[PDB]
Amino acid sequence: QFLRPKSLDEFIGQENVKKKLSLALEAAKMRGEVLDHVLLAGPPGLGRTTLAHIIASELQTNIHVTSGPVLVKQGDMAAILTSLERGDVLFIDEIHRLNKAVEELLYSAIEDFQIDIDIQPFTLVGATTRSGLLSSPLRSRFGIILELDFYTVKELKEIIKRAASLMDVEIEDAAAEMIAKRSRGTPRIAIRLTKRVRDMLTVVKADRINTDIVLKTMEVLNIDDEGLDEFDRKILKTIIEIYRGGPVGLNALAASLGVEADTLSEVYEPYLLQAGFLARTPRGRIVTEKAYKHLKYEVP
């Protein structure tokens, strides 16, 4: 809520994305034109939803939030489309999860702003974990595709220091750095960790968040020096123990973990791959030497 950027000026990091989006936004506003469709792609907690709202606010139009799975029958999509006002933003999270029914109606609406038997010109903003998850057709409809990658430790530290300030708590630089290094490159994680560290500060009655307080918090939260949580470790341990380090297929791995292949590949794998703990091969996923050493498993 109060911790969510209200404009690009408040949006830390993602310089490439900001410059690209800013170019298009400022131009459209200056011409009083409807912004071209925008695709926001990247792992969760990186700011896709945040950017969608910023786009609407900058254009000074209304944003209509919806989810791919939430829309089943064309009736749901129609009601939403016909409620759009000129320049409004239609934000669809998990846009790649749109069934053939609603998707066909959407592709149609953005071809000439009209349906089966007239829609006000609008800007479609989709959010997806992976741009490839989108069908070839609908995918070619976005004039602006923004690929968000994990944030740097420095950017995360800045976001953490900002969140602490908004929560009325002081924090030392080294402490903010420590949280950033454990935030798995994600703003969402960094902010939630900061709230939990704030709770520790409260209970120990300290004047400001320091490294000691952060370490105490990480121990309680079971977050290791690499920012890995319980589930991250379970993924690596399962590959190591049950599958001898891999390669193991995504479906097989998800079945053993008792989770959907999607949550695995879309939510947890991205950072594990980025940080060099996991690798993908044609035969399946495998763990790296870094994984064994980090989890203290003898390298076979």
| Length of the chain measured in residues | 300
| Unique residue bearing structure tokens 């589930």 | 231
DSSP at 218: H
Per-residue interface string for the shown chain with ligand ADP, residues 177-216, x marking contact by CB under 6 A: ----------xx--x-------------------------
Site residues (CB under 6 A) for ligand ADP, limited to 37-76: 44-50
The smaller minimum CB distance to ligand ADP, of residues 4 and 139, is found at 4
The smaller minimum CB distance to Co ion, of residues 64 and 285, is found at 285
Site residues (CB under 5 A) for Co ion, limited to 207-266: 249-250
The smaller minimum CB distance to ligand ADP, of residues 14 and 288, is found at 14
Name every residue whose Cβ is closer than 8 Å to that of residue 124 and which is 6 or more positions away in sequence. 37, 38, 90, 92, 106, 110, 141, 142
The smaller minimum CB distance to ligand ADP, of residues 159 and 272, is found at 159
**In 3D, which of 286, 257, 270, 274 has the Cα closest to residue 129?**
270
∠ CA 80-68-36, rounded to 5°: 65
- Residue 62 CA to chain centroid, in angstroms? 22
Single out the segment in contact with ligand ADP by CB under 6 A; choices: 2-10, 60-68, 136-144, 215-223. 2-10
Asked if 5 is part of the footprint of ligand ADP (rule: CB under 6 A), the reply reads: yes
**Which residue's beta carbon is nearest to the bound ligand ADP?**
47
40 in helix, strand or coil?
strand
Q: Measured from the CB of residue 44, what is the shortest distance to ligand ADP in angstroms? A: 4
Asked if 5 is part of the footprint of Co ion (rule: CB under 5 A), the reply reads: no
281 in Cβ contact with 247 (< 8 Å): yes
Binding partner at 250 among Co ion, ligand ADP, none, C-beta below 5 to 8 Å by kind: Co ion
Distance (Å, rounded) from C-alpha 201 to C-alpha 117? Answer: 61
Distance (Å, rounded) from C-alpha 214 to C-alpha 174? Answer: 10
Asked if 284 is part of the footprint of ligand ADP (rule: CB under 6 A), the reply reads: no
Interface residue list for ligand ADP (CB under 6 A): 3-5, 11-14, 44-50, 127, 159, 187-188, 191
Interface residue list for Co ion (CB under 5 A): 249-250
